[PDB]
Each structure stands twice: as C-alpha cells, then as structure tokens.
Design a protein around this ligand. Structure first.
Ligand SMILES: O=C(O)CCCCCNC(=O)Cc1ccc(O)c([N+](=O)[O-])c1
Lengths: 218, 211
C-alpha cells in the first residue's frame, strides 16, 4: 500500500564511495520530508541528514557533513544518499525514513546494509574447542566448533554430520577485521563424548568448502 | 547532547508501563518536538509518537504521548505481547535530531530463568598462526538483557572484546557469544581468564588456566 523500497545489502570497499537509494512508494513524495538514519552494527541509531523532496534542501548532522550528499530524484520518487570515500569505520545498516512535521518517522525502509570489507572471498579456519574449563566433569558436556576467518558472510553449519538436533546452538556471527568469525555449540552428556564421537561440518558455499573437523580433549 | 532513555525493562502482559526520555542539557520542553520510533521482528522500524503527543497512522491507542514534567515520557497502557520491542526516543536539538539508545521491552510468555554459561579454550591449532581465541558460550537466557564483563588475571579486559546481541532460540528464549581475541604471549604469562555474566543484577563466573 504506502511502501518504501530501499535495496537490500551492499559490499563497498575502503576508498570506494557509495550511492544508495531510497525508492519512495504510494504517497506524495515532495510534500513529505525525508530522513537518513544509521544503525552501526547493533548498539545505537544516529540521524545522518534531512532531504526535502520539494525544494531538495538539507540539514545534516554535525557528524555527517564531510561524508554525505543527500540528493533527490522527483520523477522516480527516489531519494538517493551518497557517502564520500569511507573508512572501515562506517560499515553499517542505513535507513531512509520519511516524515511529516517533526519525527524520525511514520515510515522507514528495510535498511540497506553496506558492509565495508579491501579483502575478497575466502575459506574459514575451523577449530575444535574442548570443554576443559572451570567446572567438575558432570552430566552434560558443552562442545564448540569455531569457524573463523571467512568471506563472504554465508556459512551453513551442521554439527554431527546431520543427525543430532538435541543440544545444538549456532551463534550469530561477528566481523573481526573486514572478514567474519563465528562459533557453533553443542552440549551432549558424558555417555556420548568422547565415546559416541563428535566432529562438526563446515559448509561455506561461495569459497568451496565442506570441512569435517574432529573434536577431542587436548 | 545525550538523549537519555532507560536501557532495558519488563512488564507482564496486561499491566501498564511508562517509558521515559531525559536529556543531558536540562529538560524536555515542548520545543523538542519529541519522538518515539520502535523496531521489532527482523529490522522493520515503526514510528510512534511525534511531537511529544501525536500518534502515528495505525499506532494503536494505548501508546500515550506524555511529556512528564522535566522529561519526555511514552506510556503503553494495557501492555501486550505484541509490544515486545526496542523503543527509540528522539529529541530535536533545534536544527538537528539526536537518538536515544532505546530500551528493549519484555512482556513477561515464559518465565525468567538464567544463562547456562560455558567459557572456552584457545585450541592447539590457532596457536600455530599465533592467534588464540576465546569464546564464552552464554545461553538459554530470559529476558534478553545480559551483560559481558571479561578479566585477564584480575585485570578487566579493555583489550579487544567482540560480542553478539541476544539471538532468540527455538522456544523463544535467548542466546549470546563473546569473542576475546589474543596472540600467544598475550595468552601465556596469564593464568585465570574470567567470564562474567549478569541477569537482573545477578552474575555468573567461569575461568581457565596455565600454571
Ligand atoms: O516541512 C515540514 O514538514 C516541517 C519542517 C520545516 C520546513 C522545511 N525545513 C526543515 O528545514 C528542516 C527541519 C525543520 C524542523 C524539523 O522539526 C525538522 N525535523 O527533522 O523534525 C527538520
């Protein structure tokens, strides 16, 4: 009905500027102010700037004057943001939001996440983590496979080759130095590990890898 | 400007709740034009109360526009399970907006049980690249607001802690992970590396060692 199509994901690298767009949809574009708001990966929002589709004029943040050019396309009711040659320090999720008098909004788009990585598609070095930590050996033991150092984001990790659902928790991934890092966990009880053996699968589609790494005590 | 909200809270589905939004520079006069915008299930943000009191087109009439005294205040009357979300307050510093950190809300489904924490070792393998990596497996927690504190031998780690935000698992209770990343000498002359987790102001502790 009244929608707001922003694109979906973008990969910029350090020193490459980006032009992102907000396609506005089903309302009278020019007679509604537009905002752009960054959400840095997971802690707090920052308003960036402000376009008026009727006259084009912008207020910026104190913070984004050396970075964005907010610019509009009236016939296609699109409202593009341009970010001049950027640091590793602004890989985020960006949102255009429209608003009438004084709001961040009444509508925001999906939020085009432009992840700023100069390094390309690469295979994850998965490590066996052993439960040898602070706690006496009792009933259920928690094991973990850490699939470190991969590019791009897509890893699809099955634990004991496929059959064991009952205790697995893969984590949401993080990104240390332009590539990603993730672990996947499991907690089967004593009368399984080490005897009924544990080894994990590492599937990472783009850079061909289907890795079977084994868990032990060290 | 610090536009300072609350950090996190709970109310049980049915009961009323009042969210506040105070600011660094004195007191939220109407001039601010106060805003409330919420996020929910997978990154969609819906806007809520504009200009201290005006409801967004379809924001249900429970949500109340209320500048309480000094501070701006949202209230969610008759709080419901369809209101468990992160709410952002926004205050207009004359010729530019500034966002609070939000609050996450919990509309008290399944009871408040704690985290099954398990810290991990740096494995024999990354020790060849001279990296040594730490995972703290923090899991099963409700509500979604736990913290991470790390200490390398008494010493609270200021050095490079990377973490996750509360991923909702399968029965709708949360999990998290914390990556402490270091190089071998930075591991070695150090014995107890200590994983600290808090729920509602109540901690847990795990460690490793070397001798
Ligand atoms: O036209 C409108 O809808 C109201 C805004 C005032 C006229 C156009 N200029 C605006 O300069 C900048 C502007 C002015 C006021 C304001 O409250 C916001 N804001 O973002 O909330 C932005």
């Amino acid at each position: 009905q009244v929608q707001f199509q922003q694109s979906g994901a973008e990969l910029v690298k350090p020193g490459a500027s980006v032009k992102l767009s907000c396609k506005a949809s089903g309302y009278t574009f020019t007679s509604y102010l537009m905002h752009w708001i960054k959400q840095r990966p997971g802690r707090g929002l920052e308003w960036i700037g402000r376009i008026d589709p009727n006259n084009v004029v912008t207020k910026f943040n104190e913070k984004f004057k050396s970075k964005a050019t907010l610019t509009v396309d009236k016939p296609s009711s699109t409202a593009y943001m341009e970010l001049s040659s950027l640091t590793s320090e602004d890989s985020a999720v960006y949102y255009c939001a429209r608003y009438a008098y004084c709001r961040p909004m009444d509508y925001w788009g999906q939020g085009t996440t432009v992840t700023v990585s100069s390094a390309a598609t690469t295979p994850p070095s998965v490590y066996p983590l052993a439960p040898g930590s602070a706690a006496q050996t009792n009933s259920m033991v928690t094991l973990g496979c850490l699939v470190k150092g991969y590019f791009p984001e897509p890893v699809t990790v099955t634990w004991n080759s496929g059959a064991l659902s009952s205790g697995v928790h893969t984590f949401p991934a993080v990104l240390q130095s332009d590539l990603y890092t993730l672990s996947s966990s499991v907690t089967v009880p004593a009368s399984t590990w080490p005897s009924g053996t544990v080894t994990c699968n590492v599937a990472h589609p783009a850079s061909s890898t289907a890795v079977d790494k084994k868990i032990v005590p060290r | 400007a610090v536009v300072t909200q609350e950090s996190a809270l709970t109310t049980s589905p049915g009961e009323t709740v009042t969210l506040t939004c105070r600011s660094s520079t004195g007191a939220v006069t109407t001039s601010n034009y106060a805003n409330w915008v919420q996020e929910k299930p997978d990154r969609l943000f819906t806007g809520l109360i504009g200009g201290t009191n005006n409801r967004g087109p379809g924001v249900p009439a429970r949500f109340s526009g209320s500048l309480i005294g000094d501070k701006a205040a949202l209230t969610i009357t008759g709080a419901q399970t369809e209101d468990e979300a992160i709410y952002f307050c926004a205050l207009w510093y004359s010729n530019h907006w500034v966002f609070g950190g939000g609050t996450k809300l919990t509309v008290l489904g399944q009871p408040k049980s704690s985290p099954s924490v398990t810290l991990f070792p740096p494995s024999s393998e990354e020790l060849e690249t001279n990296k040594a990596t730490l995972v703290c497996t923090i899991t099963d927690f409700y509500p979604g607001v736990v913290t991470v504190d790390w200490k390398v031998d008494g010493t609270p780690v200021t050095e490079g802690m990377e973490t996750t935000q509360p991923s909702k698992q399968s029965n709708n209770k949360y999990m998290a992970s914390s990556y402490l990343t270091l190089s071998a000498r930075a591991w070695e002359r150090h014995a107890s590396y200590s994983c600290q987790v808090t729920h509602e102001g109540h901690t847990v502790e795990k460690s490793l060692s070397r001798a």
